[PDB]
């Protein structure tokens, strides 16, 4: 049979990583760029009279 790497294996094929634990061999690419919201600005220091404290 021809060797598959995707999971589950394609029909009539064999999985290259088909050995026990072999899927731990499949690569990962982790993005350097996150999904994170911006946080809310503080308005009070802008929207008030500054004083010595």
């Amino acid at each position: 049979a021809t060797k598959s790497v995707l999971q589950p294996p394609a029909a009539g094929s064999a999985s290259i990583v088909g050995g026990a634990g072999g899927t731990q061999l499949l690569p990962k690419n982790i993005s350097q760029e996150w999904w994170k919201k911006a946080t809310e600005q503080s308005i009070i220091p802008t929207l008030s009279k500054s004083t010595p404290v």
């Binding site: 690569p27 690419n29 982790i30 996150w34």
Partner: protein, 54 residues
């Protein structure tokens, strides 16, 4: 990359401050990550001609 191993990190919890007195105990906040992963698929197109049609 080919396969389900493309991963994006997701910020899931963030620090938030406390208010404390002069000698009151300070406290820790929280910070947490998750991730989303995605697979690839393949699109193909092809055409075949006889030599006479070339």
């Amino acid at each position: 990359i080919i396969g389900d191993g493309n991963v994006v990190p997701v910020l899931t919890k963030r620090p938030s401050a406390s208010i404390i007195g002069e000698l009151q105990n300070k406290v820790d906040s929280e910070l947490e990550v998750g991730a989303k992963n995605f697979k690839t698929i393949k699109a193909e197109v092809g055409l075949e001609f006889s030599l006479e049609t070339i």
